[PDB]
Amino acid sequence: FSEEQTAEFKEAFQLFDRTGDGKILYSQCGDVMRALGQNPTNAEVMKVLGNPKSDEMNLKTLNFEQFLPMMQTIAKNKDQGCFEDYVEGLRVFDKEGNGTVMGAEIRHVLVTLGEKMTEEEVEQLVAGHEDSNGCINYEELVRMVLSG
Amino acid sequence: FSEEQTAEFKEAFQLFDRTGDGKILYSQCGDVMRALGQNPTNAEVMKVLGNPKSDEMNLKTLNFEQFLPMMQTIAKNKDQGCFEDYVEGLRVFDKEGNGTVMGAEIRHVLVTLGEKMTEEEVEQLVAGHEDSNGCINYEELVRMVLSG
Amino acid sequence: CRGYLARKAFAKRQQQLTAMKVIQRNCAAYLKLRNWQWWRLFTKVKPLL
Amino acid sequence: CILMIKALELDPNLYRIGQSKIFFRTGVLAHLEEERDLKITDVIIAFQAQCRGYLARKAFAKRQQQLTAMKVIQRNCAAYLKLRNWQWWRLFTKVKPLL
Amino acid sequence: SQKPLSDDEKFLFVDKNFVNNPLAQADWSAKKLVHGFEAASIKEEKGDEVTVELQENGKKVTLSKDDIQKMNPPKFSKVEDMAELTCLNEASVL
Amino acid sequence: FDQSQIQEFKEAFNMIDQNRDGFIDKEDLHDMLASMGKNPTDEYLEGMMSEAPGPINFTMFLTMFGEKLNGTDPEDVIRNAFACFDEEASGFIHEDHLRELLTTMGDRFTDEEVDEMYREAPIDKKGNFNYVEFTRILKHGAK
Amino acid sequence: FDQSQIQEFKEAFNMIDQNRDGFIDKEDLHDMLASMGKNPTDEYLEGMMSEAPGPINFTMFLTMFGEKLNGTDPEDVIRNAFACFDEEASGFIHEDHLRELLTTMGDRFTDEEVDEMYREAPIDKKGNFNYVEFTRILKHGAK
């Protein structure tokens, strides 16, 4: 992964810095490599970093020299699942395939499938992307979470 | 150190001068050094005086000029009691395991065990802290008398 | 969503960083001038300022 | 247990950090018993002697406090010889009658 | 069995020997306490050429380490479980 | 230095002295601080005046009063970051809030500073440190 | 003002009298200072009471001793500075070099202050003196 957006990577790297030493927490540099044009789960957000433990994740910060390995290991995702597979799979998931999924059931399979997101995570996902119906439209939902 | 306490040394010295001549018995002069903020055991009370024979404890009385070396080695006793040694020796004296030590049990393990002095001494250990079952709050007891 | 929400939370994380960055410096410098030496002998000449 | 093991400066190999007990084979069991017993003696007697002095401390007398008090009297006499003579006893006065 | 109220169990209620002092190494010779063997203190160890201070005999004798095995601290003598000994030699088990 | 501070030090020179010539003398400070309160030992006033070579001269006592009043970041940024640091919604940053900040942020600061600003300032005695007026005290506001 | 000085003034005033009523009553400390030392006359405390608005009350002598010990800072940093002036670390301090360095620093110093210092400094025939007692004396010590 090219060494020219190393500048952008250092930028956003220091963007979610807290120690303030050119060295950024691994969960923090992970949300960094997220908002660098990627969409990784906090799980892979951590694992891409040479697998830092939760201590290393938020205590041993990342020296930017090893953030160049991290930008490599995050640039594998760069985004998440296909939106046609999104729609067909959340249609077949939804018990009818109508076009939306219960905010109940969508927040469910967002906290009951894959990495169990914080319900604030599946909400800032779902809320802010809700249709006020309770069957939160995963189409609008997934897509504005995809762009945002 | 200074004269404000060197005259205190003189006065607390002639305090245990049952002869009132400025020269104080070795047991009584280590008792003086007790009286001077420290607290030597009669054992160390003497021990600071060149390990005096039992008569040198009493007949070779100590003048104030010879009271400065002995008082220095009274302060160098450091047998004022360590609070971890306090709590641990009282903790094996806390054979009841109450964070406290029985008054009768302490007087047993204090004047009928280990180093010796006046029975009243280990009384006013347990006395002034006597409580239920004589359960002298060994931590409270020992921090207070340490400050005391 | 997790990628979405770190993009969403960049806006709070960098501002938290900068805010605490200025906060620590100013609070510490205030406590510094509070432990300054010329504030207990100078504080009686200050009534003559 | 592992803490008091490193405080024993050991680790369980003939004894065992297990799940409910440090199981002891023959060996380290009674050796550690002996170490425990020795240190029990040590700390008991250490507190006992420090407690004899300690109890003289709790025991001093109230002559202690009256002697400290007469020393404070000497201090205050020296203090009145200190400040009431030179002009540092009249350099905050003669104005508060109008302050 | 275990009844201190009845000697009838004290022929089984185990009178595990002891020193009645909080020290545990003053009964077994740190050198070697010593087929009723002869609890002792090695005074001159030259192999088995061990003049144990035969404290059960009072004899600074070059004695067999057959007798001079780990006769564990008599605090572990006459114990319920021989395993309570430091090393279960019949110098102490016996 | 600060122009407002320079004119306030000029005002100082003109209130301590009734014969303004660009120099302050010992008798003026002595008598006036003996009037408002009472001057402490003249040694302390000599020490305050000896922070400048010989008798404190016009620009010289100006800069002397300057470096006696300053030496750390101004009141404005102090009170500003105090405001943006408040996690208590009281208007002033707490003694305990400044306390919990100084430990894990920047460098450590003893509570003796806190007790000193507490006992040596007319702040509100309720466990909250005000800085709208106290920072002006830090620039000669009331004390 | 500072806590240590005022609490020391309080303990001194409480130990000096026999019937404490928040006031310094002539007879009590009169008889005490006569018993241990020089016997004063009622003229001294008569002037002391004419040196205060009405009788000399609690806060009167409180702030009296307060600023009559103010101008002096916490002797912690002062003793830390007094120790490092030595070049061989013998443990004793000399005053003449300090006076020679201060007389060229800032303005010209006075002579009542050095008198106040000398009248309470134990000096031998070789200038032997220490700061363990000097900072104690500057803070209302025991000379």
Side-chain angles (χ1 to χ4, degrees):
Chain A
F1 204 58
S2 76
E3 297 288 325
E4 51 81 19
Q5 73 283 17
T6 309
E8 307 195 31
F9 284 152
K10 185 49 159 173
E11 163 198 351
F13 187 61
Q14 308 307 136
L15 194 152
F16 192 7
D17 195 4
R18 309 309 201 177
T19 55
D21 50 345
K23 317 300 164 60
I24 287 84
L25 290 67
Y26 276 131
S27 175
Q28 297 189 177
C29 78
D31 289 323
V32 161
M33 271 317 294
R34 291 193 188 169
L36 281 164
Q38 294 75 240
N39 300 258
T41 282
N42 56 7
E44 62 255 17
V45 153
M46 315 327 164
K47 68 86 176 172
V48 298
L49 278 156
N51 301 165
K53 70 211 161 291
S54 199
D55 179 323
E56 209 190 338
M57 195 204 64
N58 261 22
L59 277 296
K60 159 63 178 57
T61 41
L62 180 42
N63 50 1
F64 179 55
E65 299 76 8
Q66 269 285 333
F67 187 65
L68 273 309
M70 181 200 188
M71 54 83 96
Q72 302 289 142
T73 65
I74 278 284
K76 55 90 186 170
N77 53 66
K78 198 56 64 188
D79 222 355
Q80 296 305 321
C82 163
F83 198 77
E84 207 285 332
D85 280 280
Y86 274 148
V87 295
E88 72 172 35
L90 278 158
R91 282 312 83 223
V92 302
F93 155 63
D94 194 275
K95 287 75 194 173
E96 57 194 354
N98 53 325
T100 170
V101 278
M102 294 183 285
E105 83 176 2
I106 194 46
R107 270 164 187 167
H108 174 270
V109 285
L110 292 153
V111 299
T112 71
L113 302 184
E115 158 69 26
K116 311 316 173 193
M117 326 179 68
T118 72
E119 185 141 298
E120 67 85 21
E121 214 154 14
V122 311
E123 266 184 1
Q124 307 315 121
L125 162 60
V126 166
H129 312 72
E130 282 182 351
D131 45 346
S132 278
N133 71 329
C135 196
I136 299 316
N137 172 267
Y138 78 100
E139 300 189 357
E140 184 68 22
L141 170 53
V142 177
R143 73 176 49 107
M144 288 299 171
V145 144
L146 173 54
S147 44
Chain B
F1 160 60
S2 72
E3 189 39 58
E4 69 91 11
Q5 99 282 2
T6 299
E8 289 173 4
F9 294 164
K10 265 289 303 179
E11 62 194 5
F13 203 37
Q14 298 174 312
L15 183 67
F16 285 149
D17 214 346
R18 331 303 176 184
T19 76
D21 58 344
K23 301 206 53 170
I24 288 85
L25 285 69
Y26 275 15
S27 199
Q28 294 175 196
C29 79
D31 204 12
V32 165
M33 258 323 285
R34 288 150 160 187
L36 282 162
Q38 297 303 106
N39 52 353
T41 294
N42 54 320
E44 49 173 314
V45 155
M46 277 75 87
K47 173 201 315 160
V48 305
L49 297 139
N51 283 176
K53 58 212 160 290
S54 201
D55 70 84
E56 192 184 346
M57 307 181 181
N58 295 157
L59 63 83
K60 173 50 187 50
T61 191
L62 187 78
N63 198 21
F64 174 74
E65 310 304 324
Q66 300 167 140
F67 172 65
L68 270 300
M70 75 79 66
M71 70 74 52
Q72 297 284 2
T73 166
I74 289 274
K76 310 150 193 155
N77 291 333
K78 204 61 186 74
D79 201 21
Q80 301 89 31
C82 163
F83 187 80
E84 185 179 0
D85 276 303
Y86 281 158
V87 300
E88 218 166 356
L90 285 151
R91 189 73 157 180
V92 290
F93 288 166
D94 202 332
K95 289 139 297 190
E96 49 187 357
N98 314 339
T100 75
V101 284
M102 288 162 286
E105 171 215 56
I106 280 299
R107 293 188 301 256
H108 167 268
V109 308
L110 262 288
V111 285
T112 84
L113 278 176
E115 169 61 29
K116 306 300 184 180
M117 196 47 176
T118 77
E119 159 71 86
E120 80 179 19
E121 230 191 21
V122 316
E123 294 175 350
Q124 48 100 37
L125 187 67
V126 305
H129 323 73
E130 272 301 320
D131 32 6
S132 74
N133 173 36
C135 278
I136 314 307
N137 191 356
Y138 81 78
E139 287 178 353
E140 162 59 73
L141 151 73
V142 86
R143 71 187 74 183
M144 195 287 307
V145 178
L146 173 68
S147 45
Chain C
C1 164
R2 287 185 219 74
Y4 160 77
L5 261 199
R7 289 193 291 290
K8 209 76 170 309
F10 258 33
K12 77 183 189 185
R13 288 148 173 169
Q14 58 192 297
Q15 67 90 5
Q16 281 164 287
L17 161 63
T18 61
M20 60 194 193
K21 192 178 57 181
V22 311
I23 279 156
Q24 308 170 23
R25 179 195 43 79
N26 268 322
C27 289
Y30 154 76
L31 309 166
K32 286 173 186 50
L33 53 79
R34 269 314 315 188
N35 60 63
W36 193 26
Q37 175 38 51
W38 269 275
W39 192 256
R40 296 158 194 78
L41 164 58
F42 176 58
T43 199
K44 211 57 172 66
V45 177
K46 291 174 74 68
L48 261 185
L49 287 181
Chain D
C1 259
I2 321 190
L3 268 177
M4 319 203 186
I5 275 166
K6 312 140 169 158
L8 272 171
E9 294 88 18
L10 326 167
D11 264 328
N13 310 123
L14 326 184
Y15 62 113
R16 172 56 177 170
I17 279 295
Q19 327 312 312
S20 57
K21 316 179 204 169
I22 276 183
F23 271 46
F24 279 93
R25 295 138 60 175
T26 296
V28 185
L29 177 49
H31 295 303
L32 286 192
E33 297 182 49
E34 290 164 300
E35 306 178 20
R36 148 199 63 91
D37 275 344
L38 170 63
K39 191 98 168 195
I40 280 185
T41 72
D42 304 341
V43 181
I44 281 183
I45 299 181
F47 170 72
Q48 277 170 321
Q50 84 196 358
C51 202
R52 274 311 188 283
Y54 193 64
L55 285 176
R57 179 160 56 185
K58 182 69 186 327
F60 287 146
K62 317 316 155 206
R63 55 176 161 75
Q64 201 65 52
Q65 287 45 69
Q66 63 83 13
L67 173 140
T68 317
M70 62 157 186
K71 200 58 158 63
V72 188
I73 311 167
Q74 170 204 325
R75 197 226 73 179
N76 205 235
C77 166
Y80 272 1
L81 276 293
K82 174 182 299 298
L83 292 160
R84 212 164 50 100
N85 314 138
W86 187 77
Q87 311 309 107
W88 192 215
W89 193 272
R90 298 90 188 166
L91 213 51
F92 186 66
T93 47
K94 220 49 184 190
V95 59
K96 290 191 71 67
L98 59 85
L99 273 179
Chain E
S1 196
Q2 251 161 3
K3 271 184 173 173
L5 68 163
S6 77
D7 187 11
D8 281 353
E9 311 214 341
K10 182 57 201 70
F11 296 101
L12 193 60
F13 177 30
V14 169
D15 188 73
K16 50 185 307 307
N17 187 267
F18 192 42
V19 306
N20 283 256
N21 176 85
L23 187 58
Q25 294 165 316
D27 54 347
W28 156 80
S29 303
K31 283 258 208 155
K32 196 50 68 188
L33 207 73
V34 166
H35 308 80
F37 294 149
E38 302 164 351
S41 285
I42 306 178
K43 295 303 106 178
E44 170 190 37
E45 194 150 14
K46 322 167 282 308
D48 189 4
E49 280 306 274
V50 168
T51 71
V52 277
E53 179 187 0
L54 277 167
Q55 285 149 345
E56 276 201 3
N57 324 327
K59 310 177 319 169
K60 184 202 177 189
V61 163
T62 294
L63 185 87
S64 75
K65 309 298 276 190
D66 185 4
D67 312 339
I68 317 161
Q69 324 166 272
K70 185 79 165 68
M71 161 49 205
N72 307 286
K75 71 178 301 156
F76 314 122
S77 201
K78 203 209 278 183
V79 281
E80 293 188 353
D81 202 318
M82 305 296 93
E84 299 163 289
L85 297 154
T86 319
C87 319
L88 316 192
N89 288 319
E90 49 85 16
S92 64
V93 159
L94 261 187
Chain F
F1 302 94
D2 179 1
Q3 176 40 42
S4 68
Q5 283 210 7
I6 295 314
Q7 54 81 13
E8 86 165 321
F9 301 150
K10 287 298 322 181
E11 169 272 321
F13 158 64
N14 287 64
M15 45 86 75
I16 315 178
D17 316 333
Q18 312 327 315
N19 43 16
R20 288 86 55 199
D21 53 68
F23 276 91
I24 314 169
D25 205 57
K26 195 39 71 198
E27 195 42 42
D28 266 346
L29 297 151
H30 182 106
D31 283 350
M32 189 162 183
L33 163 72
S35 80
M36 174 280 317
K38 193 57 169 70
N39 77 277
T41 323
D42 311 332
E43 65 183 271
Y44 315 132
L45 303 94
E46 318 315 316
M48 178 74 190
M49 267 205 168
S50 46
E51 282 152 331
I56 67 181
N57 168 76
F58 156 67
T59 187
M60 174 169 123
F61 63 70
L62 287 177
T63 178
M64 173 269 314
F65 289 141
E67 52 84 24
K68 294 290 100 175
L69 188 45
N70 312 137
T72 300
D73 68 326
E75 64 181 4
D76 57 355
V77 303
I78 283 187
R79 72 172 55 97
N80 190 359
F82 283 164
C84 70
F85 173 50
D86 290 300
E87 311 102 326
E88 54 258 46
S90 51
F92 321 105
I93 185 62
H94 278 291
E95 149 175 334
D96 284 358
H97 267 275
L98 286 189
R99 200 56 183 165
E100 53 81 19
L101 189 74
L102 57 84
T103 76
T104 175
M105 309 263 266
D107 39 357
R108 185 65 166 80
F109 288 95
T110 178
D111 204 58
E112 196 38 78
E113 319 173 338
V114 174
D115 312 328
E116 194 71 23
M117 57 203 201
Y118 185 76
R119 75 173 54 83
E120 298 306 279
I123 47 184
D124 52 355
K125 271 43 188 193
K126 81 209 184 302
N128 190 216
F129 158 70
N130 67 61
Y131 43 83
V132 194
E133 197 288 320
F134 180 81
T135 50
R136 180 41 65 177
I137 292 195
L138 299 167
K139 309 311 164 185
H140 180 247
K143 277 289 289 311
Chain G
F1 320 95
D2 314 328
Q3 55 281 10
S4 316
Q5 57 183 359
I6 53 185
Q7 59 89 1
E8 175 263 324
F9 311 143
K10 302 305 104 186
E11 55 81 19
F13 164 72
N14 307 141
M15 55 70 76
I16 191 178
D17 279 298
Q18 43 190 310
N19 53 6
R20 201 275 181 178
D21 66 354
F23 285 79
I24 308 155
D25 178 10
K26 311 172 174 186
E27 312 323 298
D28 316 280
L29 78 170
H30 188 266
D31 287 80
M32 310 301 100
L33 175 82
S35 300
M36 196 206 187
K38 75 221 172 182
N39 188 327
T41 176
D42 208 90
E43 186 41 78
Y44 290 108
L45 210 155
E46 194 57 81
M48 211 58 236
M49 174 278 255
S50 197
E51 208 171 1
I56 196 167
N57 46 62
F58 196 26
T59 191
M60 177 69 256
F61 86 87
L62 161 54
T63 189
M64 277 199 197
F65 302 160
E67 184 162 356
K68 294 182 188 94
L69 271 301
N70 296 320
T72 71
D73 272 297
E75 307 287 6
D76 57 357
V77 309
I78 302 146
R79 298 155 210 248
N80 307 319
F82 282 178
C84 47
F85 298 133
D86 302 358
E87 306 253 10
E88 75 154 49
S90 165
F92 288 109
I93 69 182
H94 41 96
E95 295 291 329
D96 210 316
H97 178 294
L98 170 149
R99 276 322 171 190
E100 177 41 59
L101 173 148
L102 176 46
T103 190
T104 174
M105 176 47 195
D107 210 25
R108 71 278 190 191
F109 199 71
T110 79
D111 41 17
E112 59 180 0
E113 297 318 311
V114 296
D115 176 59
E116 181 192 2
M117 306 325 168
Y118 307 152
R119 63 178 289 164
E120 287 200 283
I123 318 301
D124 303 359
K125 318 316 160 283
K126 71 211 171 301
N128 174 56
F129 181 80
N130 63 19
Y131 71 110
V132 57
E133 283 284 340
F134 180 74
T135 41
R136 171 160 97 104
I137 293 309
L138 177 49
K139 274 316 304 175
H140 187 276
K143 270 294 301 306

